[PDB]
Design a protein around this ligand. Structure first.
Ligand SMILES: O=C(O)[C@H](O)[C@@H](O)[C@H](O)[C@H](O)COP(=O)(O)O
Ligand SMILES: O=C(O)[C@H](O)[C@@H](O)[C@H](O)[C@H](O)COP(=O)(O)O
Lengths: 465, 466
């Protein structure tokens, strides 16, 4: 008896995906380069249809052809070592699926090299954390279309499901398109977290809300248009008490770590010519949080204002709420515009509405908000920027003054609001028919003879200034 | 006879650097892959000690040994190919100076390869635009110290001199350190241009200043602490007209181009963990300017506010001036902190005070401002961040209210100020002993069990938040 799919890598993510697959009725082969972890998975999951293998050869031979092998191992050398360990036993047409958080260019390279050896390769993002991997993640696969069609029945069964019942998996595109989309999802997640962090700074610093008041605030926001997994868990965090009866969030060291996808999304915006200011400022905010020794030293030297009178409490809370929602809109408009630039550069012909649809559940950024994006893409598939969609244009019309008031209040109060500030600058720059780049171009021609174009005549010009 | 030095690359900077060298008395061999450009240089410079060559072999053979060859070719494949074409004709001991805007990692690789092959190599930045190349640029050389000493005399002859007479060239450090410092100079340049552009948007948006009034404003600012080449040329640009009487600044298409070093500085900050927000936002501002068709379309459908009352004209102009100066201070604090992170990462032991010193003249960012940086670094060579130096701390104390007032005004008026607003966010974040990253760490522990640290006990912790 052979299995339809096998999982290599029994750390928590691989183990949980194996259990998710097993829960849909499949018998699953499992293997780990270290036998101990495999033994542990078997001991902890009695009665489950997991079949453990202890050599790569036997693991590969246990699979029906074309083989479907899901790799959940360490990124980098561990992924190439896993692939190389499987190669001698594979047949032409077999399919290797890398579900790690791999940089997309590495997937493009692996896909091309393996294709020349006769093997298919699907690089797929998996979002949702350990719980999502076990119960229903958002899955973002890229690679050969026919290989995707051969694994789609399994992926659709294990994926999270949206409100309308659609599985949160779709064929993203060729080669590294799936890992590129996972990277952008992580960039967007960084932005959403930083936007929420600024809302917290404003509420605590401007109104002095207690943690119970913050939890109540985020609870109410989660009942409206901002409904999202990140806002929902934030209300839980502000409720959590530590032993001494005090809140846990207040003793956590304020140094935000990262595993690359945030930095990668911004480096890609820079390569592509995309103005991804919000997510990039979110990466820089984690970086400055990690310079805690310098911040503490600076705090003893540098001066600034203190919080200004906030005015009516309910009114201030509603302005921050509006600022947060419009800030999200701007961040996603920048991210989806980057998906378009990437699609063009890497020749993926991405379907933006289908991408938004699989972000409606399973992934970390899940929110009803993704349905508004799905809707905008449905009505205009090649929309250049989400800000132009009717729903978003109307929210900007109605909420921009609150965002402006929040930023002006924060700047006068000494409260840092990098992403709310970036949201306003982007909105005011994108809608400006004329920007001061005319002076920049004049300067470049003056000092470096770089030439410029004119608004009233075709051609390139150089002036002897 | 043989020439003392040769230059490959007759685009603007290379041709002018060859003329600079010739003006110090040397006879210079020149070569360009597009041979018609070499002919043009000769036809346009009769009587100068330039000797044109039309094959690489003859160009190399024309040089006195050990040979000195300065390459000023387009970055990338062009430079790689130029250097590969020279090799077969060279002798051990010859000296290759890459003065192009080469990515620093390419230089690190090339420096080891060429040195192992028996050549002396210097990867150097050259800054100054067309006029500084001709008259005296800032020069930032890296490589082995022995190689630097072989070219230090000629580079000292052609470099700009500061007002105090010190040459704007110094040994930067090993391998790719000189090209890295050149890259950072270009990032700072992007920042300074964008800060000036925002001042322009504020003066025009808030006071509706005419081009003549803009020129008068920048002229007055140039006579004070903001004195700089970029402000000096800006005051000229605002009064320049074309033959039909149009002010050039109003007919030039607002799509800012770029050749990479600005993008590279920001990609390096992202790799090094540095919060380089102002320069990075300046790069993104050039990118959004390039989406001209999109902006013109959006301007017809998205709504926004009108400019708010600016108040007393002189007071508004002074607040914008203070905001521009403090914004420059923040941008340079970010840039110099990145130089320290890069020095640590790539093992260069950079001398920050000496770098600031060679930027006092020659280069595009030249300004009396650089003397303040030089002084701060001379007093505290390993200062972590310039904002902490007495002079800069005092300016932050005195000018931050103007900068906060200008950003609030702009935001209420719908005038985009990405770098002024990034400056405030950075200042308020850098001085914050506690940031909301505690909530970010709690969220990451919640959805990804990433663990967190505590302020009251040792170790890493994981929590069941529900
Ligand atoms: O989508 C997900 O399920 C997560 O985003 C995951 O892919 C990521 O690796 C970390 O959980 C957060 O990213 P950072 O570690 O960089 O904060
Ligand atoms: O230092 C200099 O002399 C200039 O910076 C020089 O290197 C050139 O003018 C660059 O091309 C400008 O940078 P961008 O072309 O990217 O605007």
């Amino acid at each position: 008896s052979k299995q339809q799919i096998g999982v290599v890598g029994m750390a928590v993510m691989g183990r949980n995906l194996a259990l998710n697959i097993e829960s849909r009725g499949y018998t699953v082969s499992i293997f780990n380069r270290s036998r101990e972890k495999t033994e542990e998975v078997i001991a902890e999951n009695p009665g489950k249809k997991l079949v453990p293998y202890y050599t790569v050869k036997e693991f590969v031979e246990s699979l029906e052809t074309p083989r479907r092998i899901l790799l959940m191992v360490k990124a980098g050398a561990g992924t190439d070592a896993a692939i190389d360990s499987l190669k001698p036993y594979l047949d032409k047409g077999d399919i290797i699926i890398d579900g790690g958080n791999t940089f997309f260019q590495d997937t493009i390279r692996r896909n091309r090299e393996l294709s020349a050896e006769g093997f298919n390769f699907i690089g797929t993002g998996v979002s949702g954390g350990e719980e999502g991997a076990l119960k229903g993640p958002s899955i973002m696969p890229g690679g050969q279309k026919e290989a995707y069609e051969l694994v789609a029945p399994i992926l659709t069964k294990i994926a999270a499901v949206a409100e309308d019942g659609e599985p949160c998996v779709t064929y993203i595109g060729a080669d590294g398109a799936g890992h590129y989309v996972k990277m952008v999802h992580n960039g967007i997640e960084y932005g959403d977290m930083q936007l929420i962090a600024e809302a917290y700074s404003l509420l605590k610093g401007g109104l002095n809300l207690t943690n119970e008041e913050l939890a109540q605030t985020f609870t109410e926001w989660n009942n409206g248009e901002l409904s999202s997994y990140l806002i929902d868990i934030t209300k839980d965090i502000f409720t959590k008490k530590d032993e001494d009866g005090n809140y846990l969030v207040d003793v956590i060291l304020d140094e935000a770590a990262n595993k690359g996808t945030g930095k990668w999304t911004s480096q890609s915006a820079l390569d592509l010519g995309e103005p991804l200011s919000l997510i990039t400022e979110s990466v820089f905010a984690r970086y400055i949080s990690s310079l805690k020794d310098q911040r503490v030293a600076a705090s003893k030297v540098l001066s600034g204002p203190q919080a200004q009178p906030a005015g009516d409490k309910a009114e201030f809370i509603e302005k921050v709420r509006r600022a947060l929602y419009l800030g999200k809109i701007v961040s996603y408009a920048q991210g989806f515009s980057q998906l378009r630039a990437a699609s063009e550069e890497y020749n993926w012909d991405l379907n933006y509405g289908e991408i938004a649809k699989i972000f409606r559940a399973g992934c970390i950024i899940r929110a009803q908000f993704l349905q508004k994006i799905t809707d905008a893409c449905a009505e205009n598939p090649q929309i250049a920027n989400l800000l132009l969609a009717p729903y978003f244009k109307q929210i900007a019309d109605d909420y921009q003054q609150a965002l402006r008031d929040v930023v002006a209040y924060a700047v006068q109060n000494g409260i840092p609001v990098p992403t709310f500030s970036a949201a306003v600058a982007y909105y005011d720059s994108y809608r400006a028919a004329v920007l001061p780049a005319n002076l920049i171009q004049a300067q470049r021609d003056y000092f470096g003879a770089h030439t410029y174009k004119r608004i009233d005549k075709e051609g390139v010009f150089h002036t002897e200034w």
